[PDB]
Design an enzyme around this catalytic site. Structure first.
Site, PDB file in Angstrom:
ATOM      1  N   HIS A   1     -33.920  39.858  19.897  1.00 39.17           N
ATOM      2  CA  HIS A   1     -33.318  40.248  18.625  1.00 39.17           C
ATOM      3  C   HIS A   1     -32.495  39.129  17.995  1.00 39.17           C
ATOM      4  O   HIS A   1     -31.642  39.390  17.144  1.00 39.17           O
ATOM      5  CB  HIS A   1     -32.447  41.501  18.793  1.00 39.17           C
ATOM      6  CG  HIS A   1     -33.163  42.654  19.426  1.00 39.17           C
ATOM      7  ND1 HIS A   1     -34.096  43.413  18.753  1.00 39.17           N
ATOM      8  CD2 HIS A   1     -33.078  43.181  20.670  1.00 39.17           C
ATOM      9  CE1 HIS A   1     -34.557  44.354  19.556  1.00 39.17           C
ATOM     10  NE2 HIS A   1     -33.955  44.238  20.725  1.00 39.17           N
TER      11      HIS A   1
ATOM     12  N   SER B   1     -37.367  46.839  15.951  1.00 40.47           N
ATOM     13  CA  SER B   1     -36.060  47.087  15.363  1.00 40.47           C
ATOM     14  C   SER B   1     -36.201  47.983  14.139  1.00 40.47           C
ATOM     15  O   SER B   1     -36.971  47.682  13.221  1.00 40.47           O
ATOM     16  CB  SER B   1     -35.391  45.768  14.982  1.00 40.47           C
ATOM     17  OG  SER B   1     -34.089  45.992  14.474  1.00 40.47           O
TER      18      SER B   1
ATOM     19  N   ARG C   1     -36.052  47.480  28.993  1.00 41.06           N
ATOM     20  CA  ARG C   1     -37.302  48.218  28.868  1.00 41.06           C
ATOM     21  C   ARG C   1     -37.121  49.653  29.351  1.00 41.06           C
ATOM     22  O   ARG C   1     -36.615  49.889  30.452  1.00 41.06           O
ATOM     23  CB  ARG C   1     -38.400  47.520  29.668  1.00 41.06           C
ATOM     24  CG  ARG C   1     -39.780  48.142  29.524  1.00 41.06           C
ATOM     25  CD  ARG C   1     -40.306  48.028  28.103  1.00 41.06           C
ATOM     26  NE  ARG C   1     -41.709  48.421  28.014  1.00 41.06           N
ATOM     27  CZ  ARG C   1     -42.404  48.484  26.884  1.00 41.06           C
ATOM     28  NH1 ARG C   1     -41.829  48.182  25.724  1.00 41.06           N
ATOM     29  NH2 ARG C   1     -43.677  48.853  26.913  1.00 41.06           N
ATOM     30  N   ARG C   2     -37.546  50.615  28.532  1.00 40.43           N
ATOM     31  CA  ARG C   2     -37.423  52.029  28.865  1.00 40.43           C
ATOM     32  C   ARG C   2     -38.768  52.653  29.215  1.00 40.43           C
ATOM     33  O   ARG C   2     -38.927  53.213  30.303  1.00 40.43           O
ATOM     34  CB  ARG C   2     -36.772  52.807  27.709  1.00 40.43           C
ATOM     35  CG  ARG C   2     -36.444  54.251  28.074  1.00 40.43           C
ATOM     36  CD  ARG C   2     -35.805  55.015  26.927  1.00 40.43           C
ATOM     37  NE  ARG C   2     -35.218  56.274  27.382  1.00 40.43           N
ATOM     38  CZ  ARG C   2     -35.896  57.405  27.567  1.00 40.43           C
ATOM     39  NH1 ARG C   2     -37.202  57.455  27.338  1.00 40.43           N
ATOM     40  NH2 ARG C   2     -35.263  58.493  27.985  1.00 40.43           N
TER      41      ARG C   2
ATOM     42  N   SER D   1     -39.803  45.293  21.664  1.00 40.88           N
ATOM     43  CA  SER D   1     -38.879  46.212  21.012  1.00 40.88           C
ATOM     44  C   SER D   1     -39.020  46.093  19.501  1.00 40.88           C
ATOM     45  O   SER D   1     -39.027  44.985  18.957  1.00 40.88           O
ATOM     46  CB  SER D   1     -37.438  45.936  21.437  1.00 40.88           C
ATOM     47  OG  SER D   1     -37.244  46.290  22.795  1.00 40.88           O
TER      48      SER D   1
ATOM     49  N   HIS E   1     -37.952  43.600  12.533  1.00 40.96           N
ATOM     50  CA  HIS E   1     -38.629  42.630  13.380  1.00 40.96           C
ATOM     51  C   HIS E   1     -39.085  43.321  14.658  1.00 40.96           C
ATOM     52  O   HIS E   1     -38.731  44.471  14.932  1.00 40.96           O
ATOM     53  CB  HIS E   1     -37.710  41.449  13.704  1.00 40.96           C
ATOM     54  CG  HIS E   1     -36.510  41.827  14.515  1.00 40.96           C
ATOM     55  ND1 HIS E   1     -35.279  42.083  13.950  1.00 40.96           N
ATOM     56  CD2 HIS E   1     -36.355  42.001  15.848  1.00 40.96           C
ATOM     57  CE1 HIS E   1     -34.416  42.394  14.899  1.00 40.96           C
ATOM     58  NE2 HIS E   1     -35.045  42.351  16.060  1.00 40.96           N
TER      59      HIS E   1
END
Ligand SMILES: O=C(O)c1ccc(NC(=O)c2cccc(CC3CCCCC3)n2)c(Nc2ccccc2)c1
Length: 191
Positions: free
Chosen positions: A43, A113, A139-140, A111, A131
């Site tokens: 990010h 956003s 990480r889930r 991920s 993005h």
């Protein structure tokens, strides 16, 4: 030029809290997204390494396909893949394509956003997504990112994506040329 594919965790980086994982169903109305979004590392806006080619809703979740185009990043990561004992320590011995294995291991998370769910429920004025990030932590959901030289090869590595979904995904991917994409802003930390 490398391709990356996989299922995203949908996060909205909040100011108060540490992290907010959205349910994919909260953003499906705003999919698919076929305009190029930056791909960054964790990010960080200064670490653009490429661009998304498509965000798609599939049976198993939100699937992302992008291109890693930064020359500085590709050269650095390739050199590390062939010469760094640290980069090669957590991967199997003697891989046939070390670059792909090292990205697969060191940056397994994707991920996406998103804006806060406050605006998702109403009518958003501007873009819903900012993005996609290659991530080393947080990480889930299951499955990890896949890196490859051929887009079809990357998507076909996910048995959870059907033949119909892969064909829809690859239609957009093939419809874009990477040449007319601007150079990402990633700068090698060694400079
Ligand atoms: O400036 C510094 O002091 C500094 C220190 C550490 C850094 N990176 C890390 O600590 C770190 C951890 C996990 C995953 C990655 C990404 C991956 C890219 C290419 C193959 C090997 C690693 N980097 C970085 N960032 C970075 C390093 C290598 C490639 C890209 C970004 C910078």
């Amino acid at each position: 030029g490398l391709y990356v594919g996989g299922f995203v965790d949908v996060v909205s980086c909040p100011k108060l809290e540490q992290e907010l994982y959205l349910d994919p169903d909260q953003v499906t109305d705003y999919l698919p997204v076929t305009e190029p979004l930056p791909i960054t590392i964790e990010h960080l806006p200064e670490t653009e390494v490429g661009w998304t080619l498509g965000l798609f809703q599939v049976s198993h979740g939100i699937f992302c396909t992008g291109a890693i185009t930064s020359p500085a990043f590709l050269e650095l990561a390739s050199r590390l893949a062939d010469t760094s004992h640290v980069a090669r320590a957590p991967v199997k011995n003697l891989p046939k394509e070390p670059l792909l294995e090292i990205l697969h291991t060191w940056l397994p998370g994707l991920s996406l956003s998103s804006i806060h769910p406050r605006e998702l429920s109403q009518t958003p004025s501007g873009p819903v997504f900012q993005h996609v990030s290659l991530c080393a932590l947080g990480r889930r959901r299951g499955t990890v990112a896949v890196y490859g030289h051929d887009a079809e090869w990357v998507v076909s590595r996910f048995s959870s994506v059907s033949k119909s979904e892969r064909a829809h995904i690859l239609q957009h991917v093939s419809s874009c040329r990477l040449e007319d994409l601007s150079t990402p802003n990633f700068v090698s930390p060694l400079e």
